[PDB]
């Protein structure tokens, strides 16, 4: 017996019960009608949506084994069943297992990411300085930092904030996230064979995915050409090393394609997600001026004017620590989560979930619990502060999801936001170009991710 659901039309299924512009909003209205677990047929496909903390958690942590599958995202067939993000493949477990070790290896003990992030701050602040308190779009300035840090681990490379290619990768990272959040792409996601060869912006999305693979494609070969196993420069090498080690083995768990993808997945997950979060925060901060002033006091007090931020200071900085969370909690960046598939026929609660069913654990439903985070719509740092002004942890804070497939880099991301935000304000004040009262923090698009509005701003030195 399948989970409860709406009746489905022939061919199109349950598409009338969905607003492509706000799929998440749609799930939520459905949750009311049918509760926490419900069945939906979108196009041909069958999916189950879990809404709410209790339900979403069970699936994620209780059927970690049962639900480790990954739904199909067509714009991304070019990466499918390869790399780590997109495989419902047998190669996923190990590639994921290994990439993590390597990702972790670089971050904790090579002095770590902190060293890496800290050095980037120097560049970031410089570029910001170069603006000289005049209005600019932060999209391609701010984002440089997340991308470079990522670049080092992956390719031990370091772009200048001005080379064309760098910006292009970025421009492409932005364009895809943007497109992936719009109505046409949502339909394409579920009616691909149908729509694929018609003109659409689905085509631009696909081209970029390719340009990005190709750029990453070459850098891998470049790595091979110069590859010294004895000393491995970066994540990409370690990947090579592993491949050669197992070459005369007949059945392969690494291919060049496989590495290029895996590297790509990390390249933009690693880049775009953080840049978007950073950009949203600056806008949020500009709306509530008083929250910024409060922050500013702690940094100066705790860290001083010059000393660069470092994580030892998080314990000592309760308002930042909270602000950093609430931004993640408030913006609900990947709301419908990233899709899961049921590995084997499974029973959830009382229901049967078939193999190949698409299981959705929806974060935005978790992060807006109106019981956990009262006035969930509102940005309040005191969501994460207790009455004594100290930080308060929440089991409900899952921007990165949880379980078997939890975002691969929950650490880099978190560390980046704090140190990076924490720097920005050490040294600058943010000035909006319009009255603060007039900002709209609502996302412009909602699909894969929730996309913030375009804005320009001025940053005013503090020296
Ligand atoms: C900006 C902060 C980020 C947020 C809020 C975020 C969010 C997420 C979410 C919700 C998932 C889905 C997990 C699931 O299906 O249950 C995911 C997966 C993933 N993330 Fe992130 N992400 C962020 C940044 C990053 C960064 C910096 C990296 C750098 C390596 C990264 C790499 C990955 C990868 C490879 C996956 C695939 C999960 C898998 O199936 O193994 N992400 N992320
Ligand atoms: O088309 C491209 O190549 C760029 C797409 C950018 C995707 C946003 C990352 C969401 N995410 C998922 C896991 N971590 C972040």
From Swiss-Prot:
A GO term, aspect molecular function: oxidoreductase activity
Q: Quote the InterPro entries the UniProt record gives.
A: Cyt_P450, Cyt_P450_CS, Cyt_P450_E_grp-I, Cyt_P450_E_grp-I_CYP2E-like, Cyt_P450_sf, Cytochrome_P450_fam2
User: What does the record give as EC number?
Assistant: 1.14.14.1, 1.14.13.n7
Known outcome of mutating residue 46 to H: In allele CYP2E1*2; reduced activity
Its Gene Ontology cellular component terms are: cytoplasm; endoplasmic reticulum membrane; intracellular membrane-bounded organelle; mitochondrial inner membrane
The known regulators of its activity are described as: The omega-1 hydroxylase activity is stimulated by cytochrome b5.
Key word Transferase present: no
**GO BP:** 4-nitrophenol metabolic process; benzene metabolic process; carbon tetrachloride metabolic process; epoxygenase P450 pathway; halogenated hydrocarbon metabolic process; lipid hydroxylation; long-chain fatty acid biosynthetic process; long-chain fatty acid metabolic process
The residues listed in the UniProt record as binding substrate, with positions renumbered to this chain, are 268-273
Changing residue 149 to I has the effect of: In allele CYP2E1*4
**Chief localization class?**
endoplasmic reticulum
Induction of the gene = By ethanol and isoniazid.
Q: Subunit comment for this entry?
A: Interacts with chaperones HSP70 and HSP90; this interaction is required for initial targeting to mitochondria.
Q: Which family does it belong to?
A: Belongs to the cytochrome P450 family.
Name of the molecule in the record: Cytochrome P450 2E1
Organism source for this protein?
Homo sapiens
């Amino acid at each position: 017996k399948l989970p409860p659901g709406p009746f489905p039309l022939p061919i199109i299924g349950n598409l009338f019960q969905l607003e492509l512009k706000n799929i998440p909003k749609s799930f939520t209205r459905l949750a009311q009608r049918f509760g926490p677990v419900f069945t939906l047929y979108v196009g041909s496909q069958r999916m189950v949506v879990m809404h709410g903390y209790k339900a979403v958690k069970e699936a994620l942590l209780d059927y970690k084994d049962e639900f480790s599958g990954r739904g199909d995202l067509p714009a991304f067939h070019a990466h499918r069943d390869r790399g780590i993000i997109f495989n419902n493949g047998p190669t996923w477990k190990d590639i994921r297992r290994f990439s993590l070790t390597t990702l972790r290896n670089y971050g904790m003990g090579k002095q770590g990411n902190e060293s890496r992030i800290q050095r980037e701050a120097h560049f970031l602040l410089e570029a910001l300085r170069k603006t000289q308190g005049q209005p600019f779009d932060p999209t391609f300035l701010i984002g440089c930092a997340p991308c470079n840090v990522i670049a080092d681990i992956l390719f031990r490379k370091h772009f200048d904030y001005n080379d064309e290619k760098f910006l292009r990768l970025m421009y492409l990272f932005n364009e895809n996230f943007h497109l992936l959040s719009t109505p046409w792409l949502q339909l394409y996601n579920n009616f691909p064979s149908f729509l694929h060869y018609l003109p659409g912006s689905h085509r631009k999305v696909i081209k970029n995915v390719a340009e990005v693979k190709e750029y990453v494609s070459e850098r891998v070969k470049e790595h091979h050409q110069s590859l010294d196993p004895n000393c491995p420069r970066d994540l990409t090498d370690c990947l090579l090393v592993e491949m050669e080690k197992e070459k005369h083995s007949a059945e392969r768990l690494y291919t060049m394609d496989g590495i290029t993808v895996t590297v790509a997945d990390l390249f933009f997950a690693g880049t775009e997600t953080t840049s978007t979060t950073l950009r949203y925060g600056l806008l949020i901060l500009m709306k509530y001026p008083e929250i910024e002033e409060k922050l500013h006091e702690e940094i100066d007090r705790v860290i001083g004017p010059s000393r660069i931020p470092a994580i030892k200071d998080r314990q000592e900085m309760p308002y930042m620590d909270a602000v950093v969370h609430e931004i993640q909690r408030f913006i609900t960046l990947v709301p419908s989560n990233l899709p899961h598939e049921a590995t084997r026929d499974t029973i959830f609660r009382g229901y049967l979930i078939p193999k190949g069913t698409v299981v959705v654990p929806t974060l935005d439903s978790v992060l807006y619990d109106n019981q956990e985070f009262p006035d969930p719509e509102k940005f309040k740092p005191e969501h994460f502060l207790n009455e004594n002004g100290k930080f308060k942890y929440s089991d409900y804070f899952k921007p990165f999801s949880t379980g078997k497939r939890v975002c691969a880099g929950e650490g880099l991301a978190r560390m980046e936001l704090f140190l990076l935000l924490c720097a920005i304000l050490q040294h600058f004040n943010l000035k909006p170009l319009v009255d603060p009262k007039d900002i709209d923090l609502s996302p412009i698009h909602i699909g894969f991710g929730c996309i913030p509005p375009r804005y320009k701003l001025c940053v005013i030195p503090r020296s």
